[PDB]
Design a protein around this ligand. Structure first.
Ligand SMILES: [Zn+2]
Ligand SMILES: [Zn+2]
Lengths: 134, 148, 77, 93, 130, 386
RNA sequence: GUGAACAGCCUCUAGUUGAUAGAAUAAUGUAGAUAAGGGAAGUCGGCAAAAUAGAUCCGUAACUUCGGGAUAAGGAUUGGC
RNA sequence: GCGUUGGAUUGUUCACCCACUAAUAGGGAACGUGAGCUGGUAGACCGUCGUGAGACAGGUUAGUUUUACCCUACUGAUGAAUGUUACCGCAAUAGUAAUUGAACUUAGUACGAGAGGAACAGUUCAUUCGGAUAAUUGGUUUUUGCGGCUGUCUGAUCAGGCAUUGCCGCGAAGCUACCAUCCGCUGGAUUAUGGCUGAACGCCUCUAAGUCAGAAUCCAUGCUAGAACGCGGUGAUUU
RNA sequence: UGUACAACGGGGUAUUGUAAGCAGUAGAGUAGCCGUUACGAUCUGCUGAGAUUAAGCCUUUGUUGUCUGAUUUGU
């Protein structure tokens, strides 16, 4: 909920314990922590996801006012080899991170760099805050 | 459906083939295969590699500029879909390909003329070089024709 | 969730089957029979371009008598 | 909404994205544009003014066909040349 | 194998000579990167940044020894000509020829000597301060 | 004790015993239920698997997020030359099961089916059906008596057909033989259909058409004696464990006195007989008409067979069926196509699939060209030409 | 010969060509090797493996029994003609 | 019937902490002496005691069992004899598998002072599991296929050898990955419960005789093997 | 003893990355000779050339050759 649309499947690149980039100027530089929403439950398996997936995270590098604080938000770049259902495999330069509330609304107001097509179609406020899609 | 060109090989990239890379400038680099992808990763110069088309067109192999090669312009301003216009274009493309192929064959002829003169001069130097094998050739031909 | 063998879902499917799906399933049968008959007629058109009394009796009586001497018969003792 | 209600519900009704389009002829409603030919793409070659450029191309090609565009060494006659060639081929082998 | 795999990862990906061309093209871009305010995270604390080889050195003398080297000359001799865009890649195949030729004559006329003069100013600036 | 952490099983206990199948040709174990209201119709067909390929489609699927959007998909290609009818079987009902009480064969038969009956063909005198052909004399009293027996009794009727392997590039020379059920009505009319159809062919267009969901029954690609880890999917022990790490360590603490049928041991992986249902036909293409691989959108004359032919298979000079996805069996095998056993209440079996393009590039590498003309045009003139 | 080198690699003189063989290439093993994205979520425990490595130049902290620490650390390079 | 997690913490855990989740239920088959694999005697030090040798209220550290080739069980694989040989089939018995969540619409409707806010019917996709597959993407390279590199040797060029597959790059085929893709159903009888008729008991009562519905349950359809001593139909039957 | 089978070859397809040999003045400079000749990593051209291409790829109007050895079985 909060997202507009179905649970669609794109390959997994970002297990738990993965530091990925934030490039907006909300203040953060990095995102780490545990959790992935809509993750299964299997013995010995890591929670790892994308598809504009929402995840729990902390600022490892950034301002202290928002360090030490767990927060939800959404994957926008992955750098794994994803497949578009229209032809080719896609992949980015890097992973990218960035911050929001549980309804999908952003703490920041603009995004740097490209954002995934399916991530923007699934999350409206990301599409409004993004100037660059793909 | 589209047919893209490989960033490295300038080859067609059909649907369901190759890999695309999306730079931070929001720029797409699609490759026909992992060979070209890995060359891009290793930061090779495709204008130095002889198996691309860029090297060829820059070196003066199969020609670069011609009237045939201007028709495949990308078009960002569309048109009303006249099926008569579509049917005309379908014949036009086939005709243009014949014309371009003929001009290409002509360019290759222009490049490869002057080779038979060189080959003949090679053979002349060789035969005038090495007569002591020609004696073995003469005697063996004579032996064979006397044998038969 | 509702399982595959749930009575309500199966009843809903049962109601759907008699309608829009069986019509599509029945049209194909008439189409394919119409094709099957023409594939016979074309073969004809190409052609026009130019006891059981033999051994079962003996074999079965011999089997029955082997069965009745070895006593290996299911019905007879 | 109601045409949907008539034909079939939200998830079954196949809307025609066409039937709204604006054309010179209406009989060609259910046509399709070819996207790909042998190697090429139609959208790249498709201009309104292509027949005139093709006429110019044909003019140029017919000029060249009249021109000299699509078209023995002294001391040796021809059999001398063939003899030298075969002797050299023998020598290399 | 391991060398290519562990050097040319997309994690350890460098900065795509097209962009270095577009950066050395104009005055403001080169002056911005020569100025480069104090960043606590960058290796040389900002300053001592080579633009051809998009690299932060620690110190002025490490910049000197970098410039007196074949790793620098590799890049400067790679960056003289045009930058090989998809325009080149498709003009080779017979696709948007006129765009490629306009870009070529544009670089030959306008952008080429612009960048050359910028490089020369960069070189004498660095040689004078160092 | 209670394991401390629940987890699902490793493997399916229904696909047991994981042994070699008793025949290369999987046996159809159920045909659809007969409706005697409807015309006479074959329940199945035979084919030979020939590689895979890739297609693009325009999807009119309401509710989906590729509605009115393009989709790339894999497809399987089965060489389906026409099937020849040679016999009839009648299967009477009993309180033990179904029993065959008579089988009737045709007058003339081919060297292919005779080869199927034989095991050393090059030495034999080939005396297979001589006395049966003699039994096909003036009035065929025996033939008509057994046919009337089938009309009277026998309840359900199957038809013995064979393939035309001669047409394929396969180097086998021996046809397969199969019983295929007739699912129309009026046993008399079934028998009359077969009687009229002896020595005659049935094409695949006369059994299937586009947008139909069919089942593939086949045998799956033996790999041989394999271990636990790859045959069931178990974890691996960390490294340098005692007596190896590619196995189950043990059962736990508790003490049984036997090893169970449920504990994931080693053995054969593959050559199992499988029945995979609900695959949608995308094209029923024909050898008589070239430009099979072409499309309404493409208009590029070419057949489906890629450049250099398929790999470990030749060219498609025959009628073929294209289905989506992955069927059991490998290339150069014998698959049976059955039709669905039940009316399917999914819109997937209603949508009229339309193709835009088919990939005829080389599968003997990284194929970049669909046609040798395209290769010629791109590469340009070479040294050898002129 | 390379190279700082009786290191390691190849070779000349001299010596040997001895160690039960043949055919296939299933699992499990023994001895090695490579792997996308993530990088210690593994595990009692980063066990093991990986990474670093030679030579020239710059530069090198606390502490110190003032002798050291120190190849501290951290950086620029290395071919051929 | 089907599932019931991922982690932090050894100045310790007979446990607790925060997250994800539909849920993060309890137990047994060992602990009713003692039984897979892994953590938790000989040397040495501090502490308490002892005349002492030494012991302990302690604490710390280091510290070699090594099957199966035998029978059975289990997993896969052959096979004699039931006139010979070959083909097509039946199905007793045994096993059986699918699961959960979200989204469109129903509808900002029913309901509600407001705040808020469902569901059936019709549709779409994903989680866990299973079974296949190799068109594409990725990985793998003794194709030792192509090219290159260091050192040395064959007088130089060419072409090659050695460096326990010498090293670097690409690398088809094959194998392979929820790292890729595809597929995974429908009839009868029932539990709880709700009922019809109706006595027992001149009222009444779902029950006593009868009887209608009804659960992811049961039995079957479907899927897997096919009794090597279960069976049928059919083709040929020896110069 | 046949549109038979195989070994070679031909064609296609695919992998690699432009062979050996010859020439040029293109070549940082150095020497000799009154601008010129010798050396010279490398570059350019003949050259998407050359090599490999089933060993579990496709195809074949070609050349050459091969095709009755052994055992056993009856209602
Ligand atoms: Zn390419
Ligand atoms: Zn630099």
């Amino acid at each position: 909920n909060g997202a507009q649309g179905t649970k669609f499947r794109i390959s997994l690149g970002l297990p738990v314990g993965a530091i990925m980039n934030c490039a907006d100027n909300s203040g953060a530089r990095n995102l780490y922590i545990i959790a992935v929403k809509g993750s299964g439950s299997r013995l010995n398996r890591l929670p790892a996801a994308s598809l504009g997936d929402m995840v729990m995270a902390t600022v490892k590098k950034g301002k202290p006012e928002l360090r030490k604080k767990v927060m939800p938000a959404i994957v926008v770049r992955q750098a794994k080899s994803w497949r578009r259902r229209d032809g080719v495999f896609l992949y980015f330069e890097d992973n990218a991170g960035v911050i929001a509330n549980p309804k999908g609304e952003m703490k920041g107001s603009a995004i740097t760099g490209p954002v995934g097509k399916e991530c923007a179609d699934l999350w409206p406020r990301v599409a409004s805050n993004s100037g660059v899609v793909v | 459906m589209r047919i893209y060109q490989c960033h490295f090989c300038s080859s067609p990239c059909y649907p369901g083939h190759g890999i695309m890379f999306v730079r931070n400038d929001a720029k797409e680099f699609r490759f026909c295969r992992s060979k070209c992808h890995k060359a891009f990763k290793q930061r090779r110069n495709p204008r130095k590699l002889k198996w691309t088309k860029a090297f060829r067109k820059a070196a003066g192999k199969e020609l670069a500029v011609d009237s045939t090669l201007t028709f495949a312009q990308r078009r960002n301003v569309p048109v009303r879909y006249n099926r008569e216009l579509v049917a005309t274009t379908l014949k036009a493309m086939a005709r243009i390909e014949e014309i371009r192929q003929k001009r290409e064959r002509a360019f290759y002829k222009n490049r490869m003329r002057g080779n038979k003169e060189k080959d003949f001069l090679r053979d002349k130097k060789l035969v005038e070089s090495n007569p002591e094998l020609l004696r073995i050739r003469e005697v063996e031909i004579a032996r064979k024709l006397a044998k038969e | 969730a509702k399982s595959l063998r749930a009575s309500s879902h199966l009843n809903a499917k049962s109601v759907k089957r008699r309608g829009v799906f069986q019509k599509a399933v029945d049209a194909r049968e008439q189409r394919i029979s119409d094709k099957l008959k023409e594939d016979l007629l074309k073969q004809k058109l190409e052609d026009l371009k130019k006891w059981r009394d033999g051994r079962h009796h003996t074999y079965k009586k011999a089997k029955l008598m082997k069965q009745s001497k070895k006593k290996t018969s299911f019905t007879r003792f | 909404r109601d045409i949907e209600a008539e034909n079939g519900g939200a998830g079954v009704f196949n809307v025609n994205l066409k039937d709204k389009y604006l054309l010179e002829d209406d009989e060609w409603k259910n046509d399709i544009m070819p996207e790909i030919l042998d190697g090429k793409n139609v959208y790249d070659f498709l201009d309104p003014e292509i027949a005139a450029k093709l006429q110019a191309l044909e003019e140029e090609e017919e000029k060249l066909e009249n021109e000299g565009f699509y078209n023995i060494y002294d001391g040796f006659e021809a059999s001398e040349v063939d003899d030298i060639k075969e002797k050299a081929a023998w020598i290399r082998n | 194998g391991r060398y290519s795999v562990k050097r040319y990862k997309t994690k350890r990906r460098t900065r795509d000579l097209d962009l270095i061309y577009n950066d050395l093209s104009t005055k403001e871009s080169v002056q911005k990167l020569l100025n480069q305010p104090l960043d606590e995270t960058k290796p040389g604390l900002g300053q001592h940044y080579c633009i051809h080889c998009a690299k932060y050195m620690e110190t002025a003398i490490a910049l000197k020894t970098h410039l007196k080297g074949k790793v620098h000359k590799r890049r400067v001799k790679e960056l003289r000509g045009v930058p090989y865009t998809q325009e080149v890649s498709d003009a080779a195949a017979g696709y948007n020829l006129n765009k490629f030729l306009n870009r070529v004559q544009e670089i030959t006329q306008s952008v080429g000597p612009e960048k050359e003069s910028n490089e020369a100013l960069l070189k004498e600036h660095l040689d004078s301060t160092l | 004790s209670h394991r401390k952490y629940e987890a699902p099983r490793h493997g399916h206990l229904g696909f047991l015993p994981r042994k070699r199948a008793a025949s290369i040709r999987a046996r159809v174990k159920a045909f659809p239920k007969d409706d005697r209201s409807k015309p006479v119709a074959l329940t199945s067909f035979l084919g030979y698997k020939a590689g895979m390929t890739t297609i693009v489609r325009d999807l009119d699927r309401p509710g989906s997020k590729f509605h009115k959007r393009e989709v790339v998909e894999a497809v399987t290609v089965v060489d389906t030359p026409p099937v020849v009818v040679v016999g009839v079987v009648g299967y009477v009902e009993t309180p033990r099961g179904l029993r065959s009480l008579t089988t009737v064969w045709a007058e003339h038969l081919s060297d292919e089916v005779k080869r199927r009956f034989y095991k050393n063909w090059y030495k034999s005198k080939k005396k297979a059906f001589t006395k049966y052909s003699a039994k096909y004399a003036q009035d065929g009293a025996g033939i008509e008596r057994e046919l009337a027996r089938i009309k009277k009794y026998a309840s359900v009727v199957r038809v013995l057909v064979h393939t035309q392997i001669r047409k394929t590039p396969l180097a086998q020379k021996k046809a397969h033989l199969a019983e295929i059920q007739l699912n129309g009505g009026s046993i008399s009319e079934k028998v009359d259909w077969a009687r009229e159809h002896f020595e005659k062919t049935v094409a695949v267009d006369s059994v299937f058409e586009q947008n139909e969901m069919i089942d593939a029954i086949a045998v799956t690609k033996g790999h041989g004696f394999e271990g636990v880890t790859h045959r069931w999917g178990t974890k691996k022990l960390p490294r340098k464990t005692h007596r190896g790490l590619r196995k189950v360590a043990c059962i736990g603490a508790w003490h049984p006195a036997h090893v169970m049928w449920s504990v994931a041991r080693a053995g054969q992986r593959g050559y199992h007989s499988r029945t995979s249902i609900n695959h949608k036909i995308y094209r029923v293409g024909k050898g008589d008409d070239e430009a099979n691989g072409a499309t309404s959108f493409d208009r590029t004359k070419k057949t489906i067979t890629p450049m250099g032919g398929f790999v470990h298979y030749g060219e498609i000079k025959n009628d073929f069926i294209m289905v989506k996805g992955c069927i059991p069996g490998n290339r150069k095998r014998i698959v049976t196509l059955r039709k669905s056993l039940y009316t399917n209440t999914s819109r997937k079996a209603l949508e009229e699939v339309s193709l835009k393009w088919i990939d005829t590039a080389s599968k003997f590498g990284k194929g970049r060209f669909q046609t040798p003309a395209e290769k010629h045009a791109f590469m340009g003139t070479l040294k050898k030409d002129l």
